[PDB]
Amino acid sequence: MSKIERISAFLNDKEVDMTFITNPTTLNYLTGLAIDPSERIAGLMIFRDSTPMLFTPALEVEKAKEHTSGLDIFGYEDSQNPWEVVKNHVKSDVKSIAVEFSDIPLAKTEGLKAQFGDINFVNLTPLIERMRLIKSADEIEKMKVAGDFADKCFEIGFATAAERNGVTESDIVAKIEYEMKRMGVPQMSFDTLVLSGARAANPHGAPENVEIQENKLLLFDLGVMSGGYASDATRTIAIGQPNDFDAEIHKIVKEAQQAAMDFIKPGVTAHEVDAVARDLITKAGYGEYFNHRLGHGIGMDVHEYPSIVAGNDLVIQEGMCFSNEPGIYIPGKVGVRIEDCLYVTENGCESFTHTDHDLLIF
Amino acid sequence: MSKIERISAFLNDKEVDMTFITNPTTLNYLTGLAIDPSERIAGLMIFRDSTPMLFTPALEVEKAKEHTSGLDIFGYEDSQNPWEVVKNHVKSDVKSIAVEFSDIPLAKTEGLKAQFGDINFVNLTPLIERMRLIKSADEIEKMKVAGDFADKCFEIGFATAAERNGVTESDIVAKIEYEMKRMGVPQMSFDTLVLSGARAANPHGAPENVEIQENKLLLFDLGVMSGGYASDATRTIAIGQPNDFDAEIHKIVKEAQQAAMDFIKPGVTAHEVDAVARDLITKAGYGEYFNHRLGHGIGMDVHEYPSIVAGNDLVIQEGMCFSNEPGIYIPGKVGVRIEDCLYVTENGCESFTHTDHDLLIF
Numbered sequence: 001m002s003k004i005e006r007i008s009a010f011l012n013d014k015e016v017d018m019t020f021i022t023n024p025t026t027l028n029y030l031t032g033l034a035i036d037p038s039e040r041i042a043g044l045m046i047f048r049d050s051t052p053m054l055f056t057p058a059l060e061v062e063k064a065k066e067h068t069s070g071l072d073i074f075g076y077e078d079s080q081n082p083w084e085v086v087k088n089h090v091k092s093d094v095k096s097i098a099v100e101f102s103d104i105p106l107a108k109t110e111g112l113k114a115q116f117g118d119i120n121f122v123n124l125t126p127l128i129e130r131m132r133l134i135k136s137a138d139e140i141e142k143m144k145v146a147g148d149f150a151d152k153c154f155e156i157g158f159a160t161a162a163e164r165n166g167v168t169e170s171d172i173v174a175k176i177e178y179e180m181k182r183m184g185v186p187q188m189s190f191d192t193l194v195l196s197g198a199r200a201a202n203p204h205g206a207p208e209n210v211e212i213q214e215n216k217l218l219l220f221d222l223g224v225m226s227g228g229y230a231s232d233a234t235r236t237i238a239i240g241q242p243n244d245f246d247a248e249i250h251k252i253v254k255e256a257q258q259a260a261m262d263f264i265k266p267g268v269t270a271h272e273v274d275a276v277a278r279d280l281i282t283k284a285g286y287g288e289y290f291n292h293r294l295g296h297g298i299g300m301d302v303h304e305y306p307s308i309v310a311g312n313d314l315v316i317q318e319g320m321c322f323s324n325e326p327g328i329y330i331p332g333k334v335g336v337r338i339e340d341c342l343y344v345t346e347n348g349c350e351s352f353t354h355t356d357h358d359l360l361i362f
Numbered sequence: 363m364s365k366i367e368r369i370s371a372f373l374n375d376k377e378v379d380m381t382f383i384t385n386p387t388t389l390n391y392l393t394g395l396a397i398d399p400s401e402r403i404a405g406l407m408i409f410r411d412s413t414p415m416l417f418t419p420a421l422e423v424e425k426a427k428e429h430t431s432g433l434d435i436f437g438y439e440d441s442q443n444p445w446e447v448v449k450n451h452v453k454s455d456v457k458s459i460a461v462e463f464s465d466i467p468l469a470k471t472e473g474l475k476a477q478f479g480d481i482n483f484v485n486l487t488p489l490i491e492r493m494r495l496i497k498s499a500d501e502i503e504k505m506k507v508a509g510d511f512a513d514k515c516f517e518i519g520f521a522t523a524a525e526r527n528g529v530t531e532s533d534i535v536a537k538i539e540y541e542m543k544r545m546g547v548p549q550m551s552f553d554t555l556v557l558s559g560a561r562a563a564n565p566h567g568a569p570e571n572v573e574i575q576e577n578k579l580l581l582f583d584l585g586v587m588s589g590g591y592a593s594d595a596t597r598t599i600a601i602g603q604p605n606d607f608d609a610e611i612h613k614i615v616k617e618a619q620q621a622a623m624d625f626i627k628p629g630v631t632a633h634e635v636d637a638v639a640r641d642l643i644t645k646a647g648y649g650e651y652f653n654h655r656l657g658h659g660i661g662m663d664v665h666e667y668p669s670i671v672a673g674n675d676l677v678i679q680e681g682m683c684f685s686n687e688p689g690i691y692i693p694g695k696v697g698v699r700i701e702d703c704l705y706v707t708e709n710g711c712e713s714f715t716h717t718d719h720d721l722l723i724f
């Protein structure tokens with residue numbers, strides 16, 4: 001089932017006339033074009049039974065025609081009212097438009113209403129989020145590229161911490177992000193976390209210009225955007241020899257994460273995956289300190305479906321991608337998290353990141 | 363002269379019951395709070411004749427109260443419907459709300475309508491833009507800090523280029539942004555441009571992992587966000603001895619930019635400022651190659667008002683801030699731009715950036 005066909009089937013089922021898709025990430029997802037319109041107007045118009053139309057600024061039309069296929073492409077000059085050009089091209093009859101409710105601003109829905117009349121807007125985002133749940137081989141490959149960058153970030157981060165000489169959490173963040181920028185990474189997927197010692201137990205912890213603590217653990221949670229797709233991974237290392245207590249917390253988290261990784265395959269449920277890690281940490285005596293769900297979906301965003309959490313009986317299927325990230329967080333003492341995102345295969349799963357999970361001493 | 367009083371006067375003039383201001387930059391402009399709510403809900407509610415209310419996510423309430431006065435601050439927990447919490451707190455009755463049409467997504471206006479009924483929305487953004495046109499002394503001081511960072515960026519950028527040894531445009535960009543990050547400047551005001559030789563003549567040029575050319579010029583266009591305010595500046599240097607033709611292009615741009623700077627004072631028009639530089643470049647024989655407006659406004663954004671462009675007879679006033687950035691772009695030969703942003707004073711103007719404008723050889 002092609003994604004565009006699926007949206008047309010939705011329009012026919014809901015008796016909605018057309019889409020006007022505006023989020024650049026959705027446009028890239030559905031057309032392959034990474035179109036940045038800024039505050040100029042772009043929109044993908046899928047219909048119940050007609051050729052899809054892609055509307056762009058005039059200076060993007062040449063290239064859109066070359067880098068997309070199957071779309072009827074037209075543009076507008078800055079001297080024109082974009083909504084008027086849309087109306088002039090969409091000839092009859094429009095009373096309902098499917099839009100992305102959290103993206104489209106009032107100026108755009110009012111612009112559409114000025115040309116088409118009193119239209120009923122319908123939210124397309126639930127459908128798009130459902131479509132994103134199962135990744136194609138092409139998407140999985142793009143996520144592997146992002147995962148390879150994340151592994152390089154760990155290598156850079158560990159080495160930067162080991163140099164000591166007053167290096168701070170924020171120093172390490174800057175160095176990681178500097179090396180990524182040099183390699184053409186447009187942005188990290190989320191704010192890089194480097195947290196020393198007990199600071200890693202703070203759920204709202206953020207790296208600051210504080211020196212990393214000797215003989216304490218050091219948490220690295222990081223990820224990049226590459227080719228439109230995200231990575232997300234956590235490793236916790238030791239700066240000098242840790243004490244026995246912190247080393248055992250790491251061992252517990254490490255084993256819980258590996259047990260969930262060894263368990264994941266099609267047919268198990270999200271609840272069951274969460275429980276493999278949660279039960280192990282709870283048996284070890286630290287259930288009170290593992291205070292978030294085991295995992296979240298990842299794709300173009302760092303936080304999408306599925307939710308790997310108690311009470312979700314969703315059956316895991318091939319092509320799902322999600323995090324596996326148990327942790328133990330004891331305020332004022334120690335925090336450990338170990339995280340990979342993974343994709344589900346026909347008969348198991350594979351991680352997007354391969355950095356050693358063991359407690360390495362630097 | 364309070365900004366809030368000015369908005370209340372608008373509501374009374376237009377017979378609008380209250381605001382629901384959502385853009386984080388506007389919220390900072392009017393309250394001083396740098397609140398990034400992300401996908402959680404925040405809103406500033408100014409009324410015709412009652413105390414202003416600030417609605418935030420629960421975890422932002424404590425900081426809102428600590429650093430504001432005169433606002434009634436209340437929050438909502440993630441378990442609550444934010445629109446219900448808003449409705450329960452507003453005891454006056456509401457039929458019209460002033461909002462920012464280009465910011466507020468359909469989910470938020472529909473959330474308001476679900477609780478308040480059939481609301482008439484009125485665009486507040488023309489007023490906000492009018493207020494932002496004239497900067498206070500406090501805003502100019504913050505913009506001077508951002509410009510001072512931009513000057514540090516040039517020093518770093520020039521030095522990184524001088525090291526040669528295969529350094530690329532993207533290498534230099536990465537080093538600039540790395541040093542800004544280390545100084546607590548996590549984001550630039552726009553995508554840093556470093557463009558070598560004929561690549562600087564491309565109006566859509568972007569830095570890539572290509573080595574900088576010897577005996578060609580090198581264009582640096584950059585700026586930072588600091589304290590909520592932006593900077594923006596361009597310098598063009600030489601990598602090794604330039605050729606005479608490129609050096610003369612630089613001289614023409616340099617003289618045109620300085621001539622416009624010497625001309626600016628209250629009472630001149632935007633058209634006249636543009637014409638000072640444009641007439642020089644045209645007399646020199648390169649009018650066809652100066653293919654953009656002389657300047658744009660700057661403030662919290664790098665793209666605001668006034669527009670320094672032919673046909674804009676706007677009278678320049680004290681406190682306006684804008685760029686002065688002539689350029690000559692000869693495809694496949696050379697591109698030179700020299701840019702400062704400036705603030706208009708009682709009897710002239712002053713620049714936000716002070717890096718040498720001369721054609722320096724590195």
Ligand SMILES: [Mn+2]
Nearest residue numbers: 221232233234
């Ligand atoms: Mn993570």
Ligand SMILES: [Mn+2]
Nearest residue numbers: 232323325339
């Ligand atoms: Mn995660």
Ligand SMILES: [Mn+2]
Nearest residue numbers: 583584594595
């Ligand atoms: Mn610039």
Ligand SMILES: [Mn+2]
Nearest residue numbers: 594685687701
């Ligand atoms: Mn500029």
